[PDB]
Amino acid sequence: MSPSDFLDKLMGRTSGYDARIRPNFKGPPVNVTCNIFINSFGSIAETTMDYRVNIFLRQKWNDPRLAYSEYPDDSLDLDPSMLDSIWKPDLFFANEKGANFHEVTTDNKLLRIFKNGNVLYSIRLTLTLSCPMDLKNFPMDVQTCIMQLESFGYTMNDLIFEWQDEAPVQVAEGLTLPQFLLKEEKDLRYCTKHYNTGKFTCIEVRFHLERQMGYYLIQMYIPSLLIVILSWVSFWINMDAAPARVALGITTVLTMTTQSSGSRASLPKVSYVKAIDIWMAVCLLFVFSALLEYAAVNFVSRQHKVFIDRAKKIDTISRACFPLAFLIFNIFYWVIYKILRHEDIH
Amino acid sequence: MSPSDFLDKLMGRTSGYDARIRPNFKGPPVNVTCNIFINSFGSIAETTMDYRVNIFLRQKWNDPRLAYSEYPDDSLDLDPSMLDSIWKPDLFFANEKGANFHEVTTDNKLLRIFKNGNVLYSIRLTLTLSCPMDLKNFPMDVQTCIMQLESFGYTMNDLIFEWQDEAPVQVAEGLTLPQFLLKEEKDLRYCTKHYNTGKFTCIEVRFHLERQMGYYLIQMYIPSLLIVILSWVSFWINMDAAPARVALGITTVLTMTTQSSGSRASLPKVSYVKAIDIWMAVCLLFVFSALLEYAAVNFVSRQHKVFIDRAKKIDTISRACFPLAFLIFNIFYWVIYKILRHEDIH
Amino acid sequence: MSPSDFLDKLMGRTSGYDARIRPNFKGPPVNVTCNIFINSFGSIAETTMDYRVNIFLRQKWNDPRLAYSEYPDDSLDLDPSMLDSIWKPDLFFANEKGANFHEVTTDNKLLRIFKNGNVLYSIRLTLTLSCPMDLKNFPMDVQTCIMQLESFGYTMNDLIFEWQDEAPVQVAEGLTLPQFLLKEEKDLRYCTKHYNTGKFTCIEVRFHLERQMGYYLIQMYIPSLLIVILSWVSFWINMDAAPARVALGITTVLTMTTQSSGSRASLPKVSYVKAIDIWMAVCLLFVFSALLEYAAVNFVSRQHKVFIDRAKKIDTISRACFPLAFLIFNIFYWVIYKILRHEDIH
Amino acid sequence: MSPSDFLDKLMGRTSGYDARIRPNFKGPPVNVTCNIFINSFGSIAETTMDYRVNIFLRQKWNDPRLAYSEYPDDSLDLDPSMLDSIWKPDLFFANEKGANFHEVTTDNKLLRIFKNGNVLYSIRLTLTLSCPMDLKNFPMDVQTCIMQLESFGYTMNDLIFEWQDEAPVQVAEGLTLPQFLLKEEKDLRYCTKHYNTGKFTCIEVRFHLERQMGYYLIQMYIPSLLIVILSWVSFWINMDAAPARVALGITTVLTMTTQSSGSRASLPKVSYVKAIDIWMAVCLLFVFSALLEYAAVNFVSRQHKVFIDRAKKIDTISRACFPLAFLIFNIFYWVIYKILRHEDIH
Amino acid sequence: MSPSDFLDKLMGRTSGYDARIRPNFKGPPVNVTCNIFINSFGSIAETTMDYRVNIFLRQKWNDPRLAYSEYPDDSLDLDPSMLDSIWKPDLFFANEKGANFHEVTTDNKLLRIFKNGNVLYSIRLTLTLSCPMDLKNFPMDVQTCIMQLESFGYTMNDLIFEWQDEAPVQVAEGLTLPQFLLKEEKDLRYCTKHYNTGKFTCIEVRFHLERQMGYYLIQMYIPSLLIVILSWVSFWINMDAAPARVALGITTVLTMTTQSSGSRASLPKVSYVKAIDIWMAVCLLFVFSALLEYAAVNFVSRQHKVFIDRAKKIDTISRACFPLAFLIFNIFYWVIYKILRHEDIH
Ligand SMILES: *[C@@H]1O[C@H](CO)[C@@H](O[C@@H]2O[C@H](CO)[C@@H](O)[C@H](O)[C@H]2NC(C)=O)[C@H](O)[C@H]1NC(C)=O
Ligand SMILES: *[C@@H]1O[C@H](CO)[C@@H](O[C@@H]2O[C@H](CO)[C@@H](O)[C@H](O)[C@H]2NC(C)=O)[C@H](O)[C@H]1NC(C)=O
Ligand SMILES: *[C@@H]1O[C@H](CO)[C@@H](O[C@@H]2O[C@H](CO)[C@@H](O)[C@H](O)[C@H]2NC(C)=O)[C@H](O)[C@H]1NC(C)=O
Ligand SMILES: *[C@@H]1O[C@H](CO)[C@@H](O[C@@H]2O[C@H](CO)[C@@H](O)[C@H](O)[C@H]2NC(C)=O)[C@H](O)[C@H]1NC(C)=O
Ligand SMILES: *[C@@H]1O[C@H](CO)[C@@H](O[C@@H]2O[C@H](CO)[C@@H](O)[C@H](O)[C@H]2NC(C)=O)[C@H](O)[C@H]1NC(C)=O
């Protein structure tokens, strides 16, 4: 029998299908099952506090007016251009900053109608979602991104969103991030929005991401270590080499200050302290203490033999004193941020 | 009774509803009640003097031609696609730089019509609003952002805007800004625009924002303090160490100049002085004075025993003189900017 | 009488109003009166040589076919959606780089038709207009921005543009620019474009803008003064302190070179000299001369008592010689750029 | 015979051509032959890991309902505006980040229909495709870009994509890249996507690109060599010139650290080591070793004649020892990255 | 006679004008005459290798079906909104990267039809055209921009493009570029594109541009000269001032390296050498040679009277030797790049 006729017969003016009316206009709410597939995931920025994702969005619901029985086939595909004659839910993303469709050669849409009236709807989207970040423990941190899917114009009495019982969130094979690691377990929960206009449905996804130490360890931690050792070099120089020792101290202090200033080049202007700030503060304290030690020795040496060995004893003590205290500080610093990071994400 | 018929019966050619005519074509003006809900608020930039906001906008007005009495239901929802057949006010934002709608899956719109003719209209918007800023007292300042809602084509005789008596401006729970604090009280007032073309209605919202000292105190104030103390270190060096003392002074002065230059990296090119400028000027004065003190001592010492103790007395006085004057300056500077900031915002 | 009927009666197929024909198809040209209102004005960039403006554009012309006499009202407002059925002039901006409309809630348009046939048309626009700049006398300069309004498809025989006799250009109250001052007098003149295709009408607006010295005086002039004085400090040091004096000279010269390089960070790569370039060249000459003076003294002192006082006399002369010549240069430099800037803008 | 009639006769309501139905609605799948022509290729960025391409896309398939026999001509061209009445495949690019059409004067489209029903379809596109990169061996690396062409709404039972047997990928004459070399052989293979919704067809293209050493050899490798030689210069200085030798060492170490930091200015924050990182680490080790050598000599020399020649022997050994070890390191480093790069790309 | 009727009479369904058919469907090809007018020209970038232009594009061709004889007027203007009913050629730009129309108040289009059937078509466009650049002889170079105009869907048998015999390319009066000079003579030639789909027509324009030395001479050449002279200053210092001479040499070498690195801030990463690279290499060689000369003198002086005058003779020779060789190098360098630039552009 001719396939062209049934397309308008099912849902035209002859049938009386009005796309502006819910499948059950007076009765129980419409239950919608949601499902996403993460195609691409990246472009995480701390300055603007957002990330970009590319997904396929799947929806399923039942419309009794779309049932058919005269074909022998159980399921049949449709055309993207005829989506304007079918009622569809008004899903939208709450934490969105910007989004757009894809129309590279045709409309990237999929529609499928079953015998009993089940509808499968799949579209391709790209999103710029906002994600607040807690930058305490900055180089060693875990973040939790959020994705919200809620209705806009339909109250809880009409639309109710749900998650598919099995496999709600799927990730494409081989997906990797240059800077983060994406965990394999996801948290699924519920919203409920209350406004002046009423009660609205919402569902939520949580992704856990861990930062990598490979880049930061090369970039920030090692050069400060080299500056500290370079400052320590001055303890073996003759005490009479005043221009040499003073120049070494001043250069080390200024370089440490510039490095500490440059450590916050690509971060938002937050108002609390961080791990990298503590590390740079301790390094500044060490180099400043070395320069003050030389200043004290230089002042002591010119008090005119009992004043000669007094100056030498300070250098002898300092040579074995500074690295030991630095080692103790390193031990405590690295232990406390591996017992504090050990706390559960949830 | 069939729900499909009344949709066109109420407002089609049969009823004679013309969307190009006001609800009361000849008579009292149309009174519109406005209401906003702040979903997101951020991206404040001093260079371009603007900020970005994401809001829901609610409007309410009475249209006598839209009254119905045959349904038993008190209120009934509509479809977003039929908003083209209803008269709507021409609200727009005066201080806008750019704005756009949202159509991520459907049109983010809401429409609701009551029995007596009341209309509720809700849309989702994102805005880039302009906000002039007074950068005097730059690190310790309070700013007042402005949002204006005015008509464009209708004179005061036709449209009059008003605020809802209770709860005009609402803020989403947990909304925070990385750099500012948003006050909980808002100022609501009136406009009245006069042009060559006539008299137009306007309403205004004011938000008060306070800056945070956490970032700036780490970034700018502390390093200058360290540079000043580093310059003070030179007073304990032997007066014969001319290359050491001169190198220390030159390095400190050049570093202070570079820091002062870098303190205005992300600010508009204003033509008045600021608190941070005063602080950097005083620091430059201090380091320059220290270097001039050493120059004076070096010139005095070579005038050939009465000239020997004269040079030593200057160093002895300076060692206890410089920090005391710096402390007095700090006390006055921090007091005056906490009694001047104490002034009321209004 | 019913207001809905006359809307189509005046300008539909019944009346025979064809929007593709001029009001006087064969006869005298159509005279159009123009009027603008500057809502916002800013974003001036020297690198790209353009500025951004937000204006209301008003036009007035007479159409005999739109006359009505049956209403008692003298003037009546219209709807923005019906502008597609009225003939409108094809105005466009010649020096435009980019422009767009505004449709934030509705179309920001205004239409008004009088009894005799007068039409008032008002729209809201944002513009990115190009403005060539003469960067000679860069920190102390006056610029003249241009706005051109010309036709595209209608020859001089059909459309003629004119300015309103009183109040053609109006500025919103309280409008300020962070860097410039906008003069209160505007220049209005005529164009006439000649191409291969014919003769076209044009009108022009000129805005005069003056730069502010507050930012540049802090940013560039004062640090160079401090570097020059820092170089002068070396004349009081002992002549035997070769590492100290040479290090001071080298540091001052390198810092001056870096400052001169950084003085052109945000300017187009023009091929002529400017005031700031002259100032930096003179500062470089001064510091280089100081270092050469020390080199000459150091070479003279080791020619082995008649050679001892010869070296001291050079320092004694230089100490009082350098600041005096610098003061004379400052006097001439500041006088010549306040008698040359005194020239009339026109 | 009139050419206008057949245009609608072939594919209008009279013929009964429904564009929403496949050429063979029930039967074997539609076989589509693909072909591309690379017009422009560039804008490769490592930070965002993507590249931009401009191509012509050709498709060929057979539609039995479009056969004609009454013209004598074998093939006839069409108009771009009538592409809305012909069934076309829903091709799209999987690894796309953004794409758009071209409509500069008309729609850049081509359509051609043969006597037997063959269809040729050509469009112009620009693409921003994502390409993961392995930055190990960073200055000397080969990358493999990927282009995927897959269906969205049609299962494997309906659409099957194939490559043209001869000349699938063509490159415009004279196409060059500033930084890379494009190989003349391309790899063509198959996809097969499996989702929850079914089985979909895909085809793939691989491009091999090689980096050029000309820029990096000037930018990074040579300055580090000069810094190493500059550090070596210190071995010929008198051992008593403590300020000179220490200043030389400190300046060289700080400059090497700054260069190593600046070597990663435009690269993603990866977490593994690279060739340039190894080179900078070795250079830092060399300069640090030179400074430690001077520190050891300075400490040894002041142990008070047997201690005098001991210090001189260290300098004599070091002068001929450092360049030899550096040469051996250079030989091994350059050999291992020309035997490891010798590995086949596939 | 009524002007409204003939507008549809000439080209509607009554006349049978089909816009999808060429003026001569079976016969000689359509000859199109092209003409451009350059309104704005700028935004030349070496990094992305493109430039932006704003032009008017004129086309002329003959359509026999559009002839009229009943008006007395020889030529008559039309409306922009009726361009959808006239056949127009499918011109497009081959080397385009991006383009867009202008619709600031109306569509910026012009149409004019003559008695015999001649059509004049004028539109306003902005273009971002790609231009490969040869950066050899970088500060002193001449570039040749290209503009290509070719068909897309019509074979050589149907459309043939031609240039107007007189005045094909016109430039607006007073057009200037900040960095380049535009020559007054243009090169006009032919294309012929061969693809798999057939033979297509093309025409080409060439613009010759010369760079200006004013900016680069101030920015790069002079500071390197000052650094070289600063290095030469060291030859007059006492040979015993080891810290002073070594510090001067190290500072000069490091500053030269930083300047050479900064000379390529805004250039693509090409793999060949340039004039500025040669200049910086020679400057680095000079400063390194000066430092090696001091190292040799310092090593020679401590070989213990015959060794004393040997060290002094080296300084005496070097003082008159270095500037002479530098002058010879400058003479050859400036001669060879003014006899090589003397080569004809074609
Ligand atoms: C959508 O899901 C809800 C929740 O399961 C359904 O509501 C239930 O419906 C059953 C059958 O009528 C009742 O026995 C329950 O009491 C209902 N529970 C609640 C909380 O309402 C609803 O029927 C579903 N909608 C449709 C159209 O099937
Ligand atoms: C809109 O609000 C205004 C202000 O309240 C109303 O104007 C008043 O109307 C009442 C009732 O007719 C009069 O008694 C007052 O004198 C009016 N005041 C003014 C200042 O005009 C107006 O009627 C309202 N519009 C509608 C449609 O209800
Ligand atoms: C538009 O303005 C022009 C200029 O004033 C008008 O042209 C004049 O018209 C008067 C009345 O017919 C003549 O006496 C003058 O000789 C005309 N001058 C010129 C230079 O043409 C023109 O009539 C106006 N157009 C309309 C429709 O009123
Ligand atoms: C599309 O190509 C496939 C693969 O060649 C065709 O499938 C074959 O068709 C022939 C002829 O009917 C059969 O003998 C083969 O057994 C088929 N092979 C497979 C794997 O199905 C298919 O017929 C082609 N489609 C059309 C419309 O020609
Ligand atoms: C377009 O221009 C071509 C080139 O001049 C014309 O082709 C010539 O036409 C004349 C007149 O019929 C012939 O005598 C020549 O032999 C043709 N030359 C070629 C190379 O074909 C063509 O006729 C023009 N088209 C139209 C419609 O006038």
Residue numbers in the entry:
A (entry chain C), B (entry chain D), C (entry chain E), D (entry chain B), E (entry chain A): 8 to 311, 386 to 427
Tell me what the authors wrote about this structure, in their words.
Glycine receptors (GlyRs) are pentameric ligand-gated ion channels (pLGICs) and are permeable to chloride ions, inhibiting the cells on which they are expressed via hyperpolarization or shunting inhibition. The subtype GlyRα3 expressed in nociceptive sensory neurons of the spinal dorsal horn is a key regulator of physiological pain perception. To understand the mechanism of two such endogenous modulators, Zn2+ and protons, we have used cryo–electron microscopy to determine structures of full-length human GlyRα3 in various functional states. Whereas acidic pH reduces peak glycine response, Zn2+ displays biphasic modulation in a concentration-dependent manner.
GlyRα3 experiences substantial inhibition at acidic pH when activated with submaximal concentrations of glycine but is less affected at saturating concentrations of glycine.
